mmCIF file of C-alpha atoms (C1' of nucleotides) in Angstrom:
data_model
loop_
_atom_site.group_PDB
_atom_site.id
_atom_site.type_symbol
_atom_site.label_atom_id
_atom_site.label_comp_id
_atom_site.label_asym_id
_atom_site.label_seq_id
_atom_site.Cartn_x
_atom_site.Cartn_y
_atom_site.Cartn_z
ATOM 1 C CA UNK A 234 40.482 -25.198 -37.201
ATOM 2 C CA UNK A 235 37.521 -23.050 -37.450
ATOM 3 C CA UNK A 236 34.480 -25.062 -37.378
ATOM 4 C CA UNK A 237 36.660 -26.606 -34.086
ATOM 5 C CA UNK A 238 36.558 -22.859 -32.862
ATOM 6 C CA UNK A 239 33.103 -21.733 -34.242
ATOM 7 C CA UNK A 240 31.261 -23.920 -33.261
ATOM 8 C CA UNK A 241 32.967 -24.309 -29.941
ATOM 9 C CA UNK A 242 31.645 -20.993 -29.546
ATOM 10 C CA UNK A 243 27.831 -22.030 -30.683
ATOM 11 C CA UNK A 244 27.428 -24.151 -27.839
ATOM 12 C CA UNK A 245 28.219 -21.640 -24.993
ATOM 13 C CA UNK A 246 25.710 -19.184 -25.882
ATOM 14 C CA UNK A 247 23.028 -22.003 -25.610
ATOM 15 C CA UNK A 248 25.139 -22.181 -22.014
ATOM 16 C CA UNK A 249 22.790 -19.352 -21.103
ATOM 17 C CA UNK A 250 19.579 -21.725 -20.398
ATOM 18 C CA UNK A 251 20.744 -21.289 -16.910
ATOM 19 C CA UNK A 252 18.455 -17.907 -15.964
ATOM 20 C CA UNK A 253 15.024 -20.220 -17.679
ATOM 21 C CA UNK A 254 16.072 -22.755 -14.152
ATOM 22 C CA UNK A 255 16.338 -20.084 -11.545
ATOM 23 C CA UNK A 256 12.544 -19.453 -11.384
ATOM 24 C CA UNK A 257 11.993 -23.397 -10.764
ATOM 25 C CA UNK A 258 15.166 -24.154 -8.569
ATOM 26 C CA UNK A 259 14.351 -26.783 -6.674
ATOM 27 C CA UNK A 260 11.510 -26.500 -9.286
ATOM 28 C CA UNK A 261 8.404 -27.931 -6.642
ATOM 29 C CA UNK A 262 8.001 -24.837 -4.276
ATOM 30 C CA UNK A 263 10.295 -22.276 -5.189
ATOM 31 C CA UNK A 264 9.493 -19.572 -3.558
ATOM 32 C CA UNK A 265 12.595 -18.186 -4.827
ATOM 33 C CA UNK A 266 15.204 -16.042 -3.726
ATOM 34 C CA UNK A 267 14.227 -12.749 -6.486
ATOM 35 C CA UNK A 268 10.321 -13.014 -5.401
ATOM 36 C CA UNK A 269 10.828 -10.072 -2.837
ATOM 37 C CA UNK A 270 12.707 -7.823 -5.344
ATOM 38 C CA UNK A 271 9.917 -7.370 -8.164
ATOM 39 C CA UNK A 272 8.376 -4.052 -8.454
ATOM 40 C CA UNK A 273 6.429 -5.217 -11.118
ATOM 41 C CA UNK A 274 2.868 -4.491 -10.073
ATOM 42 C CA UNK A 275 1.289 -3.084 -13.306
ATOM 43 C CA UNK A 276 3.763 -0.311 -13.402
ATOM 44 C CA UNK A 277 7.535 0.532 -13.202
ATOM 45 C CA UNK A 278 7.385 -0.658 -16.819
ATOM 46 C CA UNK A 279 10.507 -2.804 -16.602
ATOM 47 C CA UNK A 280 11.256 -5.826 -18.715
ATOM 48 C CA UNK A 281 10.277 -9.202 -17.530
ATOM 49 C CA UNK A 282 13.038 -12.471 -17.623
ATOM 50 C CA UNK A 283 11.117 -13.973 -20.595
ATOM 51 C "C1'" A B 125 7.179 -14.792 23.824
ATOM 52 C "C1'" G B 126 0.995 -18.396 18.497
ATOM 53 C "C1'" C B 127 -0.976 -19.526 13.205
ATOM 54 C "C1'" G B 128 -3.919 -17.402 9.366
ATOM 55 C "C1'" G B 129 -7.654 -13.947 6.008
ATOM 56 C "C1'" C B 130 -8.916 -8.812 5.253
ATOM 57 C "C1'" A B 131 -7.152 -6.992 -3.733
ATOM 58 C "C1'" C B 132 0.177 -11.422 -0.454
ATOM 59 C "C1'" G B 133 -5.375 -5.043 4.689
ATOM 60 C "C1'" C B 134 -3.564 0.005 4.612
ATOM 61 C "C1'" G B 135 0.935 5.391 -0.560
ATOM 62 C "C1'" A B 136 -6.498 11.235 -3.050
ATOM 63 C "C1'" G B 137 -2.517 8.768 5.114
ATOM 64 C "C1'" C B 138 3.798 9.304 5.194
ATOM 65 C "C1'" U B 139 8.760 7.298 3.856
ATOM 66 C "C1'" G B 140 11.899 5.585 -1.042
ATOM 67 C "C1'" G B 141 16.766 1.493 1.742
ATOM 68 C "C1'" G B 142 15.417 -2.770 -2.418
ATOM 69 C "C1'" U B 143 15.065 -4.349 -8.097
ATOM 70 C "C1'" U B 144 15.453 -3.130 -14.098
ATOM 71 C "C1'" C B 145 15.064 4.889 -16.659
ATOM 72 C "C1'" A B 146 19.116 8.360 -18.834
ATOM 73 C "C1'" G B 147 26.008 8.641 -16.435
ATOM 74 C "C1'" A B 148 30.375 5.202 -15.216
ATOM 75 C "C1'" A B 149 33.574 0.819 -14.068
ATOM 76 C "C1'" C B 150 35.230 -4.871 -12.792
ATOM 77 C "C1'" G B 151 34.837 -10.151 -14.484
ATOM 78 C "C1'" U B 152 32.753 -13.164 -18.901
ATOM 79 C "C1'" C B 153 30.747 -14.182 -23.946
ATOM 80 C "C1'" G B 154 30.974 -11.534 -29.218
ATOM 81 C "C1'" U B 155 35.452 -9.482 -35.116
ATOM 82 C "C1'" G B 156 31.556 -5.570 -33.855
ATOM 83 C "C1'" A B 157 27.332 -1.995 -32.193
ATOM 84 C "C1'" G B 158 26.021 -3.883 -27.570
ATOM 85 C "C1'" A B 159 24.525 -7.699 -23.698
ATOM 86 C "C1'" C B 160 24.202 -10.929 -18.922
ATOM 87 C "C1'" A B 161 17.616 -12.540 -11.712
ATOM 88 C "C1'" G B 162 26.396 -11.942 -12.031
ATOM 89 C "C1'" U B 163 28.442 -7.825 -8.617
ATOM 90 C "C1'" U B 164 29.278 -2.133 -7.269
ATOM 91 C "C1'" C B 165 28.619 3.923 -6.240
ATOM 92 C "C1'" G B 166 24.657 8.011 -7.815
ATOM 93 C "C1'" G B 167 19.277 9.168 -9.359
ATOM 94 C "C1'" U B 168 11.733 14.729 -9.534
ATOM 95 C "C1'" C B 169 6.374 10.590 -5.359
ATOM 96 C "C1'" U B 170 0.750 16.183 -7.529
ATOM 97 C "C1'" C B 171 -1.952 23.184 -1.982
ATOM 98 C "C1'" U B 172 -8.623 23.664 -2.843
ATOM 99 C "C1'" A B 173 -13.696 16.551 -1.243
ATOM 100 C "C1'" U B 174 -19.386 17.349 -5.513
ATOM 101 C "C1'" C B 175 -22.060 12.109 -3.593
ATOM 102 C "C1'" C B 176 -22.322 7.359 -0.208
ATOM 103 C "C1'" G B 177 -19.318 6.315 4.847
ATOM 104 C "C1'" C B 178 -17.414 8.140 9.860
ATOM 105 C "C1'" C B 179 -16.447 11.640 14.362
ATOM 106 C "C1'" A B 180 -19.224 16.251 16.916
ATOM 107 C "C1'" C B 181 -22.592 20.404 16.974
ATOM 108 C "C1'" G B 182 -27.170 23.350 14.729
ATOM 109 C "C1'" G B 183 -32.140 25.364 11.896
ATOM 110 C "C1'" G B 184 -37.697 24.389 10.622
ATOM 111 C "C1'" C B 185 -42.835 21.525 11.018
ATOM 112 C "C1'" G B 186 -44.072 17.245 14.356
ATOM 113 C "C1'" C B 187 -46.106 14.387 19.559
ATOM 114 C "C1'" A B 188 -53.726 17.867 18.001
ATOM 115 C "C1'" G B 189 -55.243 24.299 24.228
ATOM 116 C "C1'" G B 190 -49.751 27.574 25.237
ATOM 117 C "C1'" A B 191 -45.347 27.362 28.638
ATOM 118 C "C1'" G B 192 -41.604 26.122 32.365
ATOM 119 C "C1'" G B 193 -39.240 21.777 35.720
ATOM 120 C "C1'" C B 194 -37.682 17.085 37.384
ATOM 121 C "C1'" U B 195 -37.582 12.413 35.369
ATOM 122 C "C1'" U B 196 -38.650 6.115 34.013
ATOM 123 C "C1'" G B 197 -36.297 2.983 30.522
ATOM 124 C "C1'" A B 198 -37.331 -0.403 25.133
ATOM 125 C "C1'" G B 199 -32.358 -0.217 22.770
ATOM 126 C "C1'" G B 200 -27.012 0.522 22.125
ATOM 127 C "C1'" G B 201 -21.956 1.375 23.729
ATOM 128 C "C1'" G B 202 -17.402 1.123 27.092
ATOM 129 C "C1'" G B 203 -15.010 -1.860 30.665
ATOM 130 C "C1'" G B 204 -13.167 -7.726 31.326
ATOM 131 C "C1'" C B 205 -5.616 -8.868 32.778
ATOM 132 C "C1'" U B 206 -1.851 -11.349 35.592
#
RNA sequence: AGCGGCACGCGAGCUGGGUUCAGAACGUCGUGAGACAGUUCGGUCUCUAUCCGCCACGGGCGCAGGAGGCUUGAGGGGGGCU
């Protein structure tokens, strides 16, 4: 009953590929809905989505 | 009641609403410390311009006797609506 529960829970933390498909939405022109909120011009050392 | 470039023009010209610095909470994953382009309320932006560039006003020796006065125009700018 575990490897039915741990392993269950395996395959929902690869469930979080979703925020690798936001950049390419409709994936052809996305000029997406996060490219106006970036402040990441050389400074405002912040940590990229990669 | 146009489309586009000018380091997606312009922060040693100004603002700091946005997102991802330290505080805190909701949902969700994890036994756990913690975490999530998922949401929400708060958060320090620096008096003295050396050199090119620009806007206005000056000091010397020039135009081959020393001075006053009125002037032509090479060239360049502004103005052009409905």
């Amino acid at each position: 009953e575990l490897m039915m529960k741990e392993r269950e829970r395996l395959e929902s933390a690869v469930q979080e590929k979703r925020q690798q498909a936001n950049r390419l939405d409709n994936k052809k022109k996305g000029e997406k809905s996060k490219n106006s909120t970036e402040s990441a011009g050389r400074l405002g050392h912040a940590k990229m989505t990669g």
